[PDB]
Structure formats: structure tokens, C-alpha cells
């Protein structure tokens, strides 16, 4: 079936490579393509929000997890839908890009871990019960 670690790895590798960043640890195909196209589209529609988020993160090694948790909680405070999940992936991408910009590339591995466990444990039942990634693909692919 669907592999959350693979979904996270391919998405973060795509987003980083797209902007010229490296990630050695990253360096069913329809789900990966649909997700990255949806995330690209979201980032174009809400470019101002993304640019403001990138500017405000101010990451350090000891604060990165708290910044991640703080934004994810606000993102889903009104409930989960597919668009907020795409935003969750795009935010992870922004977290990874800013980690490298602050000379903290090792954080990319941690962020990828946090995203994977969020899918595995926090979002898993919602995704499964609302049709899984196959429904996401039929809706937006
Ligand atoms: C602290 C913060 C919380 C503050 C706020 C923000 C920014 N906010 C986050 C929430 N946000 C949302 C949330 C839900 C929806 C939505 O409509 N939901 S929906 O009805 O389920 C759905 C509807 C369409 C598609 N797809 C279209 C297809 C078109 C053809 O091409 C393929 C895709 C999908 N879908 O999943 O694909 C799902 C949405 O509107 C859209 C509009 N266009 C979209 N395109 C792709 C997804 C999508 C969603 C936008 C707006 C921006 C913060 C923030 C900052 C930086 C980063 Cl980095 C991240 C977050 C932080």
C-alpha cells in the first residue's frame, strides 16, 4: 500500500531540488505527482502567505520542533481537509528550505521524520477514513 515515508521523502526531495537545495538522504507514482502538483499550485495561490512564513520562522536547532508543532496545530485547528494536508506538506518544504538557509541542513532529516510520524499517527485515521490517497488522487489528480 501507500508508504508515508516514501511520500514525505519524494516530496521534500522534489521541493528542495526545485529550489537548488541538496538533501543527501533523499538524493504509487501518481500520488507523488498529484501531491507535488497540488503543492506547487497552493504555493502559487498563497505566495504572500508562504513568503511571510519563510521570513518569520527564525529556526534554531532547539526551537525547530516547537515552530513545527506551533504551525501545524494552527493549520488544523478548524479540522482536517485535503487542502490543509497539502499546506502541511508545503510548510514542511518551507521548514527544510529555511533550515538550509540558516546553515542547519541536519534539521531536514528531523523535519522529514516529524512529517512522517504526523502522517503515521496524527492524520492516519482521517486519511484512511476519507478514502486514502486514492481519493485524493481521484479528486485532484
Ligand atoms: C499559520 C497558518 C495556518 C496560517 C495560514 C497559512 C496559509 N494557508 C494555509 C491553508 N490554506 C488553504 C487550506 C485549504 C484550502 C482548500 O481549498 N482545501 S480543499 O477544499 O480541501 C482543496 C481545494 C483544492 C485543492 N486542489 C486544487 C487543484 C487545482 C488544480 O491543480 C491541482 C489542485 C485541494 N487539494 O488538496 O489539492 C484541496 C485552500 O485552498 C486551496 C486552493 N488551491 C489549492 N491547490 C492545491 C491545494 C489547494 C488548496 C487553502 C490557505 C493558505 C499558513 C501556511 C503558510 C505557509 C505554508 Cl508553506 C503553509 C501554510 C500557516
C-alpha cell at 73: 496545530
Rounded Cα–Cα distance for residues 3 and 106 (Å): 23
The Cα–Cα gap between 7 and 3 comes to 6
Elucidation method: X-ray
Task: Tell me how many degrees the CA angle 48-53-141 measures, rounded to the nearest 5.
Answer: 70
Cα Rg of the chain (Å, integer)? 14
This structure's resolution (Å) is 1.8
C-alpha 58/C-alpha 77 separation (Å) is: 23
Q: Among positive and negative, which fits the CA dihedral 117, 53, 33, 84?
A: positive
- Of the candidates 3, 14, 1, 2, the residue with the CA atom closest to the CA atom of residue 92: 14
Q: Alpha-carbon distance 60 to 39, whole Å?
A: 25
Distance 122 CA to ligand 1 centre (A): 19
Is residue 26 within 8 A of residue 13, CB to CB? The reply is yes
Residues framing ligand 1 (Cβ under 6 A): 37-38, 41-42, 45-46, 49-50, 53, 71, 74-75, 81-84, 86-87, 90-91, 94, 140
- CA of 113 relative to ligand 1 center, distance in Å: 22
Distance 58 CA to ligand 1 centre (A): 23
Amino acid at each position: 500500500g501507500y508508504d508515508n515515508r516514501e511520500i514525505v521523502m519524494k516530496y521534500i526531495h522534489y521541493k528542495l531540488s526545485q529550489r537548488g537545495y541538496e538533501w543527501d538522504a533523499g538524493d504509487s507514482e501518481v500520488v507523488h505527482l498529484t501531491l507535488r502538483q497540488a503543492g506547487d499550485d497552493l504555493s502559487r495561490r498563497y505566495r504572500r502567505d508562504f513568503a511571510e512564513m519563510s521570513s518569520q520562522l527564525h529556526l534554531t536547532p532547539f526551537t525547530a520542533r516547537g515552530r513545527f508543532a506551533t504551525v501545524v496545530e494552527e493549520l488544523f485547528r478548524d479540522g482536517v481537509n485535503w487542502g490543509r494536508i497539502v499546506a502541511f506538506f508545503e510548510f514542511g518544504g518551507v521548514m527544510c528550505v529555511e533550515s538550509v538557509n540558516r546553515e542547519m541542513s541536519p534539521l531536514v532529516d528531523n523535519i522529514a521524520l516529524w512529517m512522517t510520524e504526523y502522517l503515521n499517527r496524527h492524520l492516519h485515521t482521517w486519511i484512511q477514513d476519507n478514502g486514502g490517497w486514492d481519493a485524493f488522487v481521484e479528486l485532484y489528480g
